[PDB]
Design a protein around this ligand. Sequence first.
Ligand SMILES: [Hg+2]
Length: 129
Amino acid sequence: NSIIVSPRQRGNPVLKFVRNVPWEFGDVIPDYVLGQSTCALFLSLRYHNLHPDYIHGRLQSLGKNFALRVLLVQVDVKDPQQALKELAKMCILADCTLILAWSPEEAGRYLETYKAYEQKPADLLMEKL
Ligand SMILES: [Hg+2]
């Protein structure tokens, strides 16, 4: 039921806006575990400028364990277009979904939205047999 949150996310104002599903910190590889094989990384564009090698290593340490991988980018920098195009390339090659959030609140809503769905819900009919 709960979103599991990496302690690396501690202090991220996004957490204030995860309000309609429980969340707790846990020892997890992604920034948010949103189900059995779904997870998200969070990246602020301001942070990305300051630490340009950060996200490539993060996406790479993540690998392919989770079926659905989501990079949630907070667009918080004037003139983000060049950064966004490079992150898009990175996501295409790493096969991850790129989502643009324009505020912490929007990012928190995206997290609750992905948590609403099981990527591989129960399949009862096979089970019954
Ligand atoms: Hg991910």
